[PDB]
Design a protein around this nucleic acid. Structure first.
Ligand SMILES: [Hg+2]
Ligand SMILES: [Hg+2]
Ligand SMILES: [Hg+2]
Ligand SMILES: [Hg+2]
Lengths: 251, 251
DNA sequence: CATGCATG
DNA sequence: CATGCATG
């Protein structure tokens, strides 16, 4: 029902998202910042073999594109549940220390979770899949996140960079959080009887009745889907009395 | 007033302490543990004079003593929150690795400190100065903590070691606590109507009335003096309404 | 692999 | 100075 009625709301049924109302982001640098190119430490063909499918997908999705940049940061093969299942992790620390910092306005629901009265006991918890990737990166700021990739029997060979906000970038959480707040501001005003808490990509909708959480939830999915975002159907806690939000269990 | 009546209770009035009822401690090693001597790190001689005043003090107190041992750990010049001067900080990690570990036995969980009945609001907070140094090291375990220190004036040039529980040794906190529990047990039984909390070298005495706290505090100080322990009068919170204990501030 | 931050 | 833990 939830999936079938809102295919564009889930990653499982609508594919990767793209925030339709968010203009490409330009990344301001610190005044004295100049390009830094960190050589890629040779990777075992194994680690490279595991990472190939992920790069290939990103490349197929257009999230990654070839490029030539005076900037370059190392790609690290991270090990997690899965033998030859290496995960591509970029070390953007040298880029991060050269990028201008931003100062949020985030009430921080993590603490503002206390701003959820017992008056609202019906919940719906959603987490957006690949949130950061929904925000586009302006072509002028794309060269900043380049890394090297060489694969003979694949096609390309040299540098690739991101066309979307990257994981590992210090301002991604804050930039995504601001964008989502701007996009859901209307939803809030239109649903004054609902309580919506949002922390980066983690959403919690609370209402005073079962019917309200139901209709409110249907309305949230519609909005997210129309906006281009994608919720994870597998981790979704739809219309529950007891839920897990930000590591905190709610009764 | 609390000094002249209990000169042996305070460090400022009774000098360094020595736990009279605590036999010299033997330090169990791990089965395969063999001697490890990590050459003295490379450190400026301009700091070789800043530590002398501290090494000279300990040697005069009998806390440090000459010795030749197959064991050896580096000594590194580190600053301290107190007076602006460089003190000796031994890196015992390699020794800590080869030493048998020990497991606690006293109720520490926060649900214990807060377990303090609001009925006892007249407190007394004390912290024992150089607590670890109150416990002696059996000579068969002294060679384990040896470190080098060369200087003509000192008389000879070779190795020094401790004859007291050393700082930076993994088990000192636990060993001292156990020792103090055994030494104060008698006191706890003699004053059942008093609440005595102790965490390493941090004590809290709480009674129901102001007079009982005054009697209980006098009694505690006299007991610690007889036992050889020394309280820091500089930071002693003698029989107050508002006191800070282990961080928290309670009334 | 490389580093930042804490700790002996 | 060294190094153990976390993290990009
Ligand atoms: Hg996306
Ligand atoms: Hg580029
Ligand atoms: Hg002492
Ligand atoms: Hg010795």
């Amino acid at each position: 029902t939830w999936l079938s009625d809102f295919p564009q709301a889930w990653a499982e049924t609508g594919g990767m998202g793209l925030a339709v109302r968010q203009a490409p982001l330009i990344i301001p640098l610190k005044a004295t910042s100049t390009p830094v190119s960190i050589k890629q430490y040779p990777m075992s063909q194994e680690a490279r073999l595991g990472i190939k499918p992920h790069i290939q997908r990103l490349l197929d999705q257009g999230i990654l594109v070839p490029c030539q940049s005076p900037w370059n940061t190392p790609l690290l093969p991270v090990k997690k549940p899965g033998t030859n299942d290496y995960r591509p992790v970029q070390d953007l620390r040298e880029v991060n220390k050269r990028v201008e910092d931003i100062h949020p306005t985030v009430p921080n629901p993590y603490n503002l979770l206390s701003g959820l009265p017992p008056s609202h006991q019906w919940y719906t918890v959603l987490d957006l899949k690949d949130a950061f990737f929904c925000l586009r990166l302006h072509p002028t700021s794309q060269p900043l996140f380049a890394f090297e990739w060489r694969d003979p029997e694949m096609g390309i060979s040299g540098q690739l960079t991101w066309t979307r906000l990257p994981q590992g970038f210090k301002n991604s959480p804050t930039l995504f959080d601001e964008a989502l707040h701007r996009d859901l501001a209307d939803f809030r005003i239109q649903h004054p009887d609902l309580i919506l808490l949002q922390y980066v990509d983690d959403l919690l909708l609370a209402a005073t009745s079962e019917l309200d959480c139901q209709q409110g939830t249907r309305a949230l999915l519609q909005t997210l889907g129309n906006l281009g975002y994608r919720a994870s159907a597998k981790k979704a806690q739809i219309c529950q009395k007891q839920v897990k939000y930000l590591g905190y269990l709610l009764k």
